[PDB]
Structures are given as C-alpha cells and as structure tokens.
Paper text:
Here, we identify and characterize a unique GlcN kinase from the soil bacterium [name], closely related to Streptomyces spp., the classical antibiotic producers. Determination of the Michaelis constants (Km) for glucose and GlcN suggested that SjGlcNK is better described as a GlcN kinase (EC 2.7.1.8) with a strong preference for using GlcN (Km = 8 ± 1 mM) over glucose (Km > 100 mM) as the substrate. In addition, the structural and biochemical characterization of SjGlcNK provides new insights into the role of these unique GlcN kinases as the missing link for the incorporation of environmental GlcN to the metabolism of GlcNAc in bacteria, an important intermediate in peptidoglycan biosynthesis, glycolysis, and secondary metabolite production.
SjGlcNK was crystallized in two different monoclinic (P21) crystal forms, A and B, which differ considerably in the dimensions of the respective unit cells. In this movement, the linker connecting the two lobes (residues 187 to 191) acts as a hinge and the catalytic lysine, K133, which sits far from the active site in the open state I, approaches and establishes contacts with the catalytic D317 in the closed state VI, likely corresponding to the active conformation of the enzyme. Curiously, the conformation of the side chain of D317 changes between the nucleotide-free (where it is coordinating the single and more tightly bound Mg1) and the quaternary complex structure (where it coordinates the two magnesium ions).
Residue numbers in the entry:
A (entry chain C): 4 to 20, 27 to 65, 70 to 89, 95 to 117, 122 to 173, 177 to 433
B (entry chain B): 3 to 11, 14 to 19, 35 to 63, 70 to 113, 121 to 435
C (entry chain D): 3 to 23, 29 to 89, 96 to 117, 123 to 434
D (entry chain A): 4 to 20, 28 to 65, 72 to 89, 93 to 115, 121 to 436
Amino acid sequence: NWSELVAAADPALVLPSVAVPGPLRLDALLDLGEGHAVGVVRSADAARWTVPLVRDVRRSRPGDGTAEHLVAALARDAAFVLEAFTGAAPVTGERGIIVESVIVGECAVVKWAVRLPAEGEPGSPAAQRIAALARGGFTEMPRPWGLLTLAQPVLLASVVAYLPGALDGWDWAVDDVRRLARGELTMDQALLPAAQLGTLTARMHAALAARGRTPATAADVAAWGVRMREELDEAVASVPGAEGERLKAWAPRIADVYAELDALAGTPLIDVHGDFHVGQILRADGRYAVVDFDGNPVLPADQRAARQPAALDVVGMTASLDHVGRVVVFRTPDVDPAPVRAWIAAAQRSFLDAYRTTLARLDADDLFDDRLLTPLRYAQEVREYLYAVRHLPHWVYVPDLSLTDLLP
Amino acid sequence: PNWSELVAAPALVLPLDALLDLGEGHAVGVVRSADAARWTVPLVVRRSRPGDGTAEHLVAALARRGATPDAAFVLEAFTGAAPVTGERNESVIVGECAVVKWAVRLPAEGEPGSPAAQRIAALARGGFTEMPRPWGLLTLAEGAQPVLLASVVAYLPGALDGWDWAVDDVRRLARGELTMDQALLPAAQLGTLTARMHAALAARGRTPATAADVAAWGVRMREELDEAVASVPGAEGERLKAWAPRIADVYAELDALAGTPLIDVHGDFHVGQILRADGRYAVVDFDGNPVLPADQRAARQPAALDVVGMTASLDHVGRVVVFRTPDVDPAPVRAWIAAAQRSFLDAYRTTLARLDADDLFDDRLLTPLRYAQEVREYLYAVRHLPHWVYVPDLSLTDLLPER
Amino acid sequence: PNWSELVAAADPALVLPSGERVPGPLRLDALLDLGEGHAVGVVRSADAARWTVPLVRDGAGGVRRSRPGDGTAEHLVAALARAAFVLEAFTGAAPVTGERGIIVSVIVGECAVVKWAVRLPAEGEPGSPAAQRIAALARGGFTEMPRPWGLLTLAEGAQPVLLASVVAYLPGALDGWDWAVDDVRRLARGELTMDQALLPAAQLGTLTARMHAALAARGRTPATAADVAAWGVRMREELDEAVASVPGAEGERLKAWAPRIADVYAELDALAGTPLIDVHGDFHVGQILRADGRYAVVDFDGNPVLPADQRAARQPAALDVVGMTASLDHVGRVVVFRTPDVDPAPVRAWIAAAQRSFLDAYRTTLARLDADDLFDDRLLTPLRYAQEVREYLYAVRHLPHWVYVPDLSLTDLLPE
Amino acid sequence: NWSELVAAADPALVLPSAVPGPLRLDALLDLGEGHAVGVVRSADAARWTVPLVRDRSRPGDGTAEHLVAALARTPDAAFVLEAFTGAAPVTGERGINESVIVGECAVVKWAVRLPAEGEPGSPAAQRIAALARGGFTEMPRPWGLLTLAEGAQPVLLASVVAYLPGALDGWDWAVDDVRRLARGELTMDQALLPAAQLGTLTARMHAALAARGRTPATAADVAAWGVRMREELDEAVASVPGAEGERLKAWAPRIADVYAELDALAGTPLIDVHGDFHVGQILRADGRYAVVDFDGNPVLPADQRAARQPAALDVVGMTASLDHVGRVVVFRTPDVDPAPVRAWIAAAQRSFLDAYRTTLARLDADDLFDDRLLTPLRYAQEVREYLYAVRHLPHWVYVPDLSLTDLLPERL
Ligand SMILES: [Cl-]
Ligand SMILES: [Cl-]
Ligand SMILES: [Cl-]
Ligand SMILES: [Cl-]
Ligand SMILES: [Mg+2]
Ligand SMILES: [Mg+2]
Ligand SMILES: [Mg+2]
C-alpha cells in the first residue's frame, strides 16, 4: 500500500541527494501506472514535498521512468490537475540534468517542485505564469508541454520543451558586447538584441495582464519602502572596503528616492516574471525564449506569487544589461571600455524604446509606470550588494560602477 | 619560369633565397623582403591556402623514407609520419591526424629564432612521449644553427589546456565530486612529466651560468619589482611596497649562484601548456619565453625556471576557483594549493633521481624565481587585466611567511 | 529606288532611334516587306555592326526610320496575325491597329507591346536569347509572363537572330522595385502583417521554379573544369575592380573585406559537373510585374555585364536564385534608406524571412516538378558575394550613392 | 436637440478615424435633411469641427455634399458661409484634417483640430479670401469658406476649393523638367520658363496678400529671429554626424555672423505670407500653376502659424526649393550629367528672382521684398534641412551640404 509504504519509509525518501523529521505521511498520490506515482509527502515538521515514487518503494531516479510516465499521462485524480498543451508527445528515455530536472525523450524537460509550501500558503506561481502566456499567444518561450498542480493550485511538476543548443543571457549577451568591443559587430548590430528583448517583455506583460490588474494600495507602496530601506541598511552594514564607503555616502540620497514611493498609490500591479534578467533569456538561432517563472528568490516563498509592477521586470532587465557591460570590461583582457560603456546606455535606451512602443501597439500603455524606474533601479543595485557579500564577494564592483553612473 | 623570377613578380608572404620543391607545383620557399625580412611562404604562383595541397605534400615528403637530402633544407621525419590526405603564424590541419604550422615570420640571417625544432627533436630522441606525437620538422641549414620553417605534430581535438581541466578538477574538489587524493594525482603526474622533459632536453648538454648571467638575473628582477611597486594601486600596492625590501633581499641570493646548470628548457611552462588528451597529458608550445626578445628565446635557462612556472600556475588555479565560484568553500581549495605544489615537487625530485638527473634542478633558485613569477603577475594585471592583482597578492601572502 | 540603294545612300544615323546625341556607309542585309511602304531592315554598318531598323518610305522616293505612329509596328502585328524570316505567332495575336510610343518600344492597339532588337550580333555570332526563352516557356505551360503574341527572327546558323518581339500590354502594371517597395513600406507602418508581406516572396519562389523547370526542358550542360575556372577569374577581376574604384568609408570596409570575399570564390573549383541550363540572366524584382494579384516576368535579353556574344550561354539555375534573393535584400535597404520616419526593425526582419520564403517555395516547387538537381545550393554563397560586388560596380559607374546597398548587405553576410 | 445628443455622446465622436468627456456643443450649423456641422468642445477646452448627421459623418454620408449644396445659395449669425463664383451642387463623396472629394471636382477639408477659444488658428481662410479679393487666379478655384464668428479672428471650420485630378506638385514636374534638361529633351530656356512663371506667381500672390496690411518689424522681432536661428544652428551642429557635420561645425561661425546682421533690419515690412512655400505647394495643371496649403509653417506653434512674416521668407523657401530640386536629380538619376543641372540650379533662382522683382514693379509693390533678408533667411532654410535629415531622413544631409558649399563662398 502506498500510504503504508511511505509512512514506514526513511524520512530521506523526499530528498534527491540532509535531515528530514520523520515519520512521513502521504497526503496525496497520483498513480502514473506500471508502479510509478507522484507523491505529496508530508514530513514530521509539517513540511510538504513532491516525491516521484516507484515500487520495488524508493524515490524515482533519472532512468526509472517516472518523468517518462508523467509525460505520457499528459498525452493521455480529483486532488490533482493535469493540464496538457499543444505539442506534448509520449517520448521515452530519461536523462538527468543538474540545472530536480529530467530530460525526457531528449526533447522535453520535467522539473519536480521538490519543496512545497505549507498547506494553505502560496507557493511558486510558475503554473499560472506559463498557462497565462500560453493562453495569450506568447510564443517567445520554451514550448510548454504540461503542468501538474495540486488543488491557487500548488505546482508539483512542469514539462517544457528542451533546447539543447541554447545559451542564457550571461553567455550570448556577454559574447555580443565582446564582439562589439573588438570590432566584430557594429553598434546597431549589438543593440538589436536589446530591442528584441523590449518587444519580448511587453508581449509577456500584455499576456500576463490578461488575468487581472490590482491597483496598489497605500499599505502596498508603504511596505515597499520599508523593505527597500531595510535592504539598504543591511547592505551598508555588510558591504566592506572602498565600495562600502561609497555605499554609505550614497545611502542618504537613495533613501530620499525611496520616500517618493508613498505618492505612487494606485499604480497597476499585474502578474510579472519576478526574477527578470538576461540570464533568464535563452537565444536559439535568432529566437529568444524566457524561462524561470518561480519568482524572486530573495522574497519570502509566500510572496513570490504576489502581483508586482510591470516596471519591476523592466528595471531587472535594464540593470542586467548594465551589469553585462560591467562584466565584459571586468573579465576581458585588453578590452576597449569605450564601446562597452557606450553600449550600456544605448542598450537600456533601445530596450525602453521597444518596450514602450510594443505596449502602445498592444494597447497596454498604462501597465508601465515609469515613475518607478529610479526607485526600483536603486533597489536592484542594492540587491547586487547583498548577493555579493553572501555568495560572490568580488561582485560588489558591479553595483558600485552602476550606481556611479546613476548618481552623477 | 623558374621559382626565382616567378616569386619576384608582396602579399604572397602574408595569409627568394631557398626553395624546397614538393612536386606537382607545390613548394616551400624562403622569401626575403626589401627590409631584409625573411618569410616562409608555401607556394603553389599564389600563396598556398588550406585545400591547395601544399601542407599535404609536405606530410607526404615526411612519410617518404629514403629521399635524397637537399643541401639547403633538412627534413627530419618521425614514426608518426603517414601520408594522410585532406586540409583544414599559419597552421593547417592535414587529414585530421597532423597539424602543419608554417613559421611565417623568420629571424634575420644569422639571428636565432624559435628553438621549437631543437626542443621537439631532443624530446623525441630521449623517449619523451608526453606530447603531441611528432611527425616531422623542416629546417633551413644555417651554420650549426637551424632555422625552423615548419612543424608537423599529431592532432588532438578533444584536448583541453590546464586552465580548463585543472580549474575543473579543483572546482569539483570544492563541491565534493573529487577526493583530495584524486585532485592531487594530476599535480603529481605533471611533476613526473616535467622531470622526463628536462632529462631529455639535458641530453644535448648543459652550460654553467656565469657570474654575469646570475648578475643579469637580479638586475632584470629588480627592475620588474620597481615597475610593479610603481604601478599597482590601492591596498594591494601598499602591501607589495612593504614586501619589496624582503623580496629584493631574496634576489641578492643570486650573486652566489654562479655555476648553476643551464639547459634547454620549455621557456613558457605553466598549466595552460599541458593538454588532457586520451587520458594522458601532452605539453605544447616550445617557442620560448614571450617576455624575452626574439633572439633570446633559444637561450638556455635553469630547469627550476620551468618548475616555478608550473608551481605558480598551480597556485593561481586555486585562486581562480575561490574568486570566480559563488558559494565556494575556500578551505579545500587552499588545502589543495599547498598539497598540489608538494605533489609536483616531490614527484619532480624523485623522477629526476630515477633518471640520474637530480643535478639539473637547483632548488636554491626556487624561492627567488618564484617571487619573480608572482611579481610578473602584477605587471600583467596593471597592463592587461587590472583586477588580477588579487592572484599575486594572495599568493605572496602564503609564500613570504613560509619562505 | 529599291530598299538596298536607299539604305546605302542614307545617313548612318538611320539605324539609331533617338540615341542620336555609327560609321558609314550602310549596307542592307535583309528586308522583310510589310506592305504599303513599311519594312523591317537588317542594316550592317561599316564596323560590321548590324541593326534592326524599322523602315518607311516618305513618298518622295526616300527612306527614313519608323517613328511611333508611322504604322510599321502596326504592320508587323498584322503580319503575325496572317524561309529567310520566321514569323512565329502565339495564341492571342490579333491584327490591332494604332501606335503609341513608350520609353523603357511601340504600343500597338493599346493591348500589345512591340520591341525592336535595335542592336544585333555580328554576322554568325549569337545575340539575345529572348526568342528562345519565351518560346520555351510558352510551349512549357509557363503562364506567369505577359502573353506572347509573336516573334520575328532571322534564320542564321544555329540560333535565329531575334529581330522583334510582341507581347501583351499590361497598363498600370508595376515592376518589383515599385510593388515590393510598397509592400515593405506598408509592413513598416503596420498596414500589412508579416505573413501578408511574405506571400509575394513565396510566390516568386514558385514562379522561378516553374520558370527553370520549363527552360531546362531544352536540355542541360555539365559545367566543365574550365567553365568553373573562368567564373573565379571573372569574379576576382570584378572584386579587384570594385576595390580600386569604390571610394569613401564603404571602400575602406570593402578593402578589409576583399581577402574574405576572395576566400569564398575559391570554393568554385569543386563545382565541375554542376548543371547549366537556359536561365533568365538578369533576374531581380524589377523584372517581375504585378497585375491584379498575378505576377509576370519580362526582359529575357540576358545579363548586361556579360559580352553580347555570351548572354545566350547557359548558366547555373542558382544564378537567377541569387539574383532574386539579393534584390529582396536590396528592397529592404531601399525602404529604410528612402522612407522618412521608417521603422527599420520590421523591414530588416522581412529581409531574412523573405529570402527563406523564396528559397523554401523554390525548393519545394522544383521537387514537385521533379527538378531538384537543377539547383546546386553550393553556388548560393559564392554567387551572392559576386552579386554584391556587382552592386559596387553599378554604383561607381551609374549611381555613386548606391554603394550603401552592398555595404549594408555585406555587413550582415560576413558576421554570419 | 442637437446639444442634447452631443453632450451624452462618446467623447471619441470628434475623431475622424483619447478625448476627455463630457462633450459640449458650442455652435451648430444646420445644413438641412438631418445634416449639420458642429463645433464640439471637449472637457479639456479643446474645440473640434465635427460633421454631424442624425440616424459623426463619414465620407459618403452626404454632409460634405450638403455643405457644397449650401454654398450654391449664412443661415446662422454665429457662422460665416462666404461662397464664391464656382460652387456647384455636385454629388458623390470620396474620402482621400479630413479631405473629401465631392463630385470629383471639389475638395472639402474639415478643420478637425480647432484652436482654443481666443487663440489663433490656421489663417487659410484669410489667405484664400484675400487672394480672391485681389483677383489672384493661380490657385485652385475657391468654392466657399466656413468660419466661426469669434471677434476679429474668425475660426476656420471648412474650406472648399476646386479639385485638380491630374495636377502634379512641384516635386514631380520640376524634377521631371530638370531630368529632361539633362537628357537633352529640353533646352535650358525651356527648363527655366517655369522658374520665371513661379516668380511671377509668388509676386502676384504677395501683392494680393499685402493688400490686407503691412506691419513694420520691431526691434524685438528681428532679435527673436537671430535667437531662434542661432538655436537651430547650434542644434544641427550638435547632431549632424560624419564629414557633413565637420563642415557645418566649421561653417557655423561664419553663418552665425550673418545672423547678427538682422538687427539692422528693424522696421522691415511684415505681411500675410504663405508660411510653407516650396515647389511641392505648386500644382501644374494643363499649363497653369496653382499654389496650395495655406495653413502656415508646421514647425511653428499652432497659435503662431497665422502671424505675419517677411515676404522674403517665401522667397528663400522657393529659391532653396529650386536648389534642392537640382540636388535630387543629380543624386537619384543614373548616368545623369550634373553639369546642366548645376547650371540650371543657379539659373532657375535668377529666373525666379528676376520675374519676382519685375512683377512687384509691375504691381507697384516692390516695397514688401527686402533683399537684405535673402542671405540670412536662406542659411536658416538650409540649416533646417540638416534638422529634417537627422530627425526624419538621415541621408538627406547631402542636400544642405551641397547647397551651402555653393552659397557660402558666393554670398561672402
Ligand atoms: Cl565577475
Ligand atoms: Cl579572475
Ligand atoms: Cl537609393
Ligand atoms: Cl534623396
Ligand atoms: Mg535562470
Ligand atoms: Mg527590366
Ligand atoms: Mg503640400
């Protein structure tokens, strides 16, 4: 019996590869056939997991056939919701990919949502983001094959198209600016991706806004300033060296900009990407595809599904375009910084010109409130300080050089 | 029309005193310019391009055993020479098995050039096989000092240089994918490799360094130090300025090192010169030290010069892993830094003893030449990659207390 | 006072239309009497050059060249509507009357166009192959052209010398340099969707394949090693000529591109045996007329850059393909260059997608017609670079500012 | 009630194809049979001329016909319906501001966007009326003018003039004339005849427009000219790239020196002018010539397009226009011989000026032309070609560059 096997199983059954409080309890089970299933296992600490199960009971490994049986289920029960999309095929064969991700049929990617939110709490809105884009004709993304949710429905697994010959933005955008610096590309040729990124972002927001639109309240815009001023104080307190001395001096002028958010009540809030930057854009032979709709990892898990301004994605991409230029100057030996520095301003300009034009073409002008550009941009650069002191210490140069141009 | 009047009719040298006819219209000519500049132009009278068959005919001339020797050229073939077909300083892949490299820019008449032909030939005659398998060497006879014209070695497509596989090995060590012993095996095998390379190159003889030689070493190493002290900015420059008196005192040890053996060396030895091909390691690029002028890259150097070049690069691999990897655990990496250098030196010293060549390595040169290799990283940073100053800073922070 | 004596005593400018702004004396080699004092004359000048001269007697015992309105083109249409000359009539020929000149020729009956082959090849030399091209398309079912009415040739050797052609007149019809530019402009300002702006490019690929399949029915010739060798010599001479004459910044970039362009031309030596058929020769958008959704191809006189005695020779079918795909690129450059306040992003996206729509429809239609082997796609890259070099030569010789088209075209070709 | 139906209507009613409501009808001209012309004011005090019909008039509903039929013999004191000899009750409307071809021989042009209450608008009704008052015939035959009574400044609502179906504007026939000159199909004297005829047309036009009045330019007027022209010069120097920008940057000191001589031109006469004068505003119809488009300079503010200007402003606008016609022919025509074209450039301007000066002397009105303004106003005209180029057609910079290359050494 499923519930009799999971309860008597080792509490580490919910783990792909340290300590899980036991015993376990099976809340929901989706039988996939031939001894395969998708389990919603509840540990002793009231934590919920998504566990692909296979009988002899052990956790499914890449090659057992559970991700394969899930894709076959999409190509054809009350607690679960299987929503398939045009293009799902019953391909076979499994292969692990440490992006848990499993390549099925060498053309689809099954991703298990290992850690689930608590019973009732919101989780990842990736199922609602991908479904809204699909229903809205948004094609600049990996072709969705299916979504497995638990009745907002809790996301359990997703199947999208696999693009083996595609690179993320931290590869092709860096390569573009490098070829521009050494004369292999013209300035207009280097600005072309940024313009197409703006068109992509507006098409994404127009498709995502088809669900709804929530006016921001006074408590909403007030909570933004509280969190942003709280992150600024954490950055000032933790960023060391000469970068920290400049950040401490720039902190008063930044907080003054943050206070301008109180007057921006009533600004539209829609479903957004959340963690939008160049690295979330895959290029495949002139075509661009956006991935990763789980939300901003720095936000709490129960807030990664909340609606945000459309300008939040705009400042996230424009800042990454700025960061791409800083990386090219920082890493490339003998690089000419003049074309790269000139590309930083023009790429952000090309992006905004195309993002604003496409919104007007799609009758979605009021989605973008450009009064949020300056405050959210500074908040993005402050996050770069926090990411550096936590994961990559030398990365502090990126926001330091970016804020040097933003604060003349 | 003969080859002389045929070539005298200027872009022919860019992708006549001697002509090596390869048959069927293909040939190799040593063409001279109006500025007395000598060139190796593959002729066919257009300049040979990949697909014409000139480098393919050169390979056929190597695999052809018994041909009458030309009085001007010297074609020294090896066992790897095979008449492969198909084509793909200029380099041309021949038959996906050999790589032909035309020495486009030649030294002046009587001026020494690349010693690559002497290095490869000495290694092949000494039984050294940890390199791309040599096929042949084309040299121009010039009075007990051959001028390299073309090099033909084996082709290794899936081979990565050290700045890829060593950085990957250490990065896997920091994540637990490799044990410490596994990550230390390549360093120990490089030491065995370097000792075999020096023992084979020393078969051509050794020259005792004169008092003027070791004095010239200190002069050049102080000028690099003063240029580094005057260029490196910020807090790293302040530490280098405080370390400069202690570094310059170690440079004074060279005055009493007259008579140390100088042999044919690699010249530009670091981990990026070691390829990982077919589970084995291969050393490449025997052109000499790039920072030395063109006419000094063939000169003999201490064997410890290749040693410090590899041990320093092994240290720098660890610094790169800690610097570039987010969430990295620096403790296993820094433990590997000291252990890999020990594994290299311990294997290099024992292998030399097993070959009766322990007198090639003068470890008294180890500390002074290592400091000069780290200070030379400062000069690379301020001139090419400014943020690179962290590498010689973190390296000297570990070296100076120990030494 | 017969025709021969009148031509022998006439001023040598008799053989010229209105380009009188020719060494004598003249000599009449052929005379087709059309009746009532009208005739078509083959006049040889003192430099052995031959001409097609419409003649008319002026009543006073003299002769003069016919003008639009004298009735000589009128009598030719009547002759086609019923040995030495060959009056080959096609379905649709009618004895219409009334003449009207047009500068591109005489429009007869307000429904037919008569074109005189003013300049002829030397005696025994081959000239314009237009009579053989139209006849091959007509007997092959090719309907995407102005309706052929008649052809007047002179029997001489193996190829009859084309003297005059009569095709249907399409009033108001525009060539590609008008409707393709208009389509892309409408696309640039949102008046057409992307799929609507690509349909003409797809239909041109179907047209070209139907054209090549019909023309190849007269046979094919494998290119010899000497043929493909002459291609590289001619194409490299044109590159050296463009480098030496193209000025400005475009010339500076072309000098840095010449070593790479010449590297492409070295791929021709492995193309011996590729098929050569009767081709259009001067194929581009400007040769495609649009008349109420239908497309029609014109001007089969050959390529003007080649010598006159080589414009009838067989060429690779890919020559017409790279001619059209390059002009599709040139349409996009012209739209961006000439249109004020133009959005270049949809125009440049059209340049790439139109060439793919043309090639895909061309490959498929050739496959539907069992004519796959006519198209050697290995010629696409070398012939495309040669076509852009020809743009440089046209600019420095006829329209100096035109250098921007091959400059901006090669700026997008070389990086890829 | 017409006012009740417009008030409760969608605010987009004033658009022909974003307007704040509610709408308020200020005046309504009853045309009959359910047709009317309405002056609708939006909630932002933006006034509109809206053709109305019971159940916004579309081209084909008949409202443009009823306006033409009303001109064939005002029914309301608030409006002024000045008809002319030539208005015929033609039927059949065809759309082509909003212009509707009525009867295939008349053009009815609605003034969709009206000026604010009390602010000046298009002076087109004053221009056409003054030209007809003086007997000027070299224009499309006017049929009628519809204006709203508003003090001493009637607000233009609609204008009806004759439709010339086969007439081409200057940028067609002038370019064609110069091309035929380069091919030898026209003699030099034949290609210069239109330039003289335009000179006579411009002087006849100015003499009729100057009859309405003449204002001496104040010291602040000539001072504002130099400031505006110096800003346009600094703006072009800072934006024109390439070698053309390097020459303009080096020419700018010499050009700005000519802009300083305007301060002595205080008191120069200012009259009602065309405001946007070039060859493209001249229609050639069966051997005759007709001037069109009397709305004013489109780069000026809307409430400034009716202000009086020097008569020399229209002169330099046409002489520079003739210069650019030659540059276009050389630039676009393959195998063209530039020698007769460049000879025509200098000869056409001389032919235009000689006829202009002679006709003003014929009409005893040579005082309105101050030739001291020729050089500075011509420089400003060419400088604006740089601005139009960098803003709309980037390669157009060759036109003012080739023009200033001949003007600068000759004028100085
Ligand atoms: Cl970095
Ligand atoms: Cl680094
Ligand atoms: Cl053009
Ligand atoms: Cl133009
Ligand atoms: Mg990502
Ligand atoms: Mg044509
Ligand atoms: Mg106009």
